[PDB]
From a paper:
Lipid transfer at membrane contact sites, such as the ER–plasma membrane contact site, is facilitated by oxysterol-binding protein (OSBP)-related proteins (ORPs). Most human ORP proteins contain an N-terminal pleckstrin homology (PH) domain and a C-terminal lipid transport domain. The PH domain recognizes and binds the target membrane, while the C-terminal transmembrane helix anchors ORP8 to the donor (ER) membrane. In the case of ORP8, the cargo lipid is phosphatidylserine (PS), which is synthesized in the ER but needs to be transported to the plasma membrane.
However, despite years of efforts, we have only been successful in elucidating the structure of unliganded ORD8. The structure was solved by molecular replacement using an AlphaFold model. The RMSD between the model and the refined crystal structure was 1.44 Å, and the structure fitted the 2mFo-DFc composite omit map well. The overall fold is reminiscent of a β-barrel composed of anti-parallel β-strands. Compared to the well-studied β-barrel structure, the GFP, the ORD8 domain is composed of more β-strands (19 in total), whereas GFP is composed of 11 β-strands. However, in the case of ORD8, in one side of this β-barrel, the β-strands are replaced by three α-helices. The fold is therefore actually a mixture of alpha and beta. This observation is consistent with the previously reported structures of ORP2 and ORP3 that exhibit similar fold with RMSDs at 5.27 Å and 5.32 Å, respectively. The structure also revealed a rather large cavity (its volume was estimated using spaceball to be approximately 1860 Å3) in the middle of the barrel. This cavity, consistently with the previously reported structure of Osh6, represents the lipid-binding site. The full-length (including the lid) ORD domain never produced any crystals.
Numbering used by the authors: 426 to 774
The structure:
């Protein structure tokens, strides 16, 4: 079926996790190593609550497709930039880069999409590591993502649950938190779905533990005081303030950017025309297959414009990555132009 389709590219949906980059600026300033992990994890859980259940099925992005967007930080008077590019359609790998130098953090990663069909239920996995770096500290956080289990395609209630075991690891300080997304059992209950449980630990010693639901309250209890507290809850006041995202002017967008590329596919979905939504998709995929043939005909060499593969490590690296800490006497404004994230400085370095 294809009535299960969200009018957003996967590169677009991949940027949803940074609507609370407000938190990451705070974490960069937190001086206690333990409290930085708490605030990093609190940010991680902040990117799953808007997720809708059911039809949601981002577009499989096309090779060379690019999404580019921006967020505004009023309190720190700065901006968080996001750039993602589809580097391979076979395999379906999309790379992303996030940079906010004034607030002292950046993220990089690459995500491979693999699905498995159980008949009535579908499970799409996202495997890959995201590296959060605090520029001023030279301190990295490596984290993975869960997988989405979808039941009710053919018959039964249509649902989307999150499951898996995520590891958020910081080797510099020795801290880490292991999270476990728990799927509802056969019996089920009013609170069995979206259950999240985890534990914050240093080295191997467990400092504190987490319980709750990832779309609702999550509670932390200290393993030394056994006193419970609210670790994270998406309060409507917290929801009321999600950083405002700014996309590129449609007339200024390249033809292979996500919004311009999928416009006709998106319009069909929003118009509820199911038949013309599939046809418009086949136009893009048929062009991709034809552009893949044309490539093999004379020279099969596809240059990713904004990303490049490191042969030694096998990881995808943003061509224009910059990790130098913010220098107030030199750095003036971080900006982006044509997918290139830059900073205006009064001294070249």
């Amino acid at each position: 079926p294809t009535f299960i389709l969200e009018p957003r590219s996967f590169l677009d949906k991949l940027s949803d996790y940074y609507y609370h980059a407000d938190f990451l600026s705070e974490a960069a300033l937190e001086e206690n190593p333990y409290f930085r992990l708490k605030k990093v994890v609190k940010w991680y859980l902040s990117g799953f609550y808007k997720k809708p259940k059911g039809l949601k099925k981002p577009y499989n992005p096309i090779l060379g497709e690019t999404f580019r967007c921006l967020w505004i930080h009023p309190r720190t008077n700065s901006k968080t930039f996001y750039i993602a590019e589809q580097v391979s359609h076979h395999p379906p790998i999309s790379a992303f880069y996030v940079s906010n130098r004034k607030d002292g953090f950046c993220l990089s990663g690459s995500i491979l999409a693999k699905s498995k069909f159980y008949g009535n239920s579908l499970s799409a996995i996202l495997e890959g590591e995201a590296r959060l770096t605090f520029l001023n500290r030279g301190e990295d956080y490596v984290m993975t993502m869960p997988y989405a289990h979808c039941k009710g395609i053919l018959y039964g209630t249509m649902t989307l649950e999150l499951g898996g075991t995520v590891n958020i690891t910081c080797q510099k300080t020795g801290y880490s938190a292991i999270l476990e997304f728990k799927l509802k059992p056969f019996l089920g209950s009013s609170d069995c779905v979206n259950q999240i449980s985890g534990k914050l630990k240093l080295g191997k010693e467990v400092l504190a533990t987490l319980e709750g639901h990832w779309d609702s309250e999550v509670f932390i209890t200290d393993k030394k005081t056994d006193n419970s507290e609210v670790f994270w809850n998406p309060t409507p006041d917290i929801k009321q303030w999600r950083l405002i995202r700014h996309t590129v002017k449609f007339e200024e967008q390249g033809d292979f950017e996500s919004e311009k590329l999928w416009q006709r596919v998106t319009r069909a979905i929003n118009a509820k025309d199911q038949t013309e939504a599939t046809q418009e998709k086949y136009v893009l995929e048929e062009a991709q297959r034809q552009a893949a043939r044309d490539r093999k005909t004379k020279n099969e060499e596809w240059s990713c414009k904004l990303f490049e593969l490191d042969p030694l490590t096998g990881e995808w690296h943003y061509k224009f990555a910059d990790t130098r800490p913010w220098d107030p006497l030199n750095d003036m404004i971080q900006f982006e132009k044509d997918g290139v994230i830059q900073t205006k400085v009064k001294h070249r370095t």
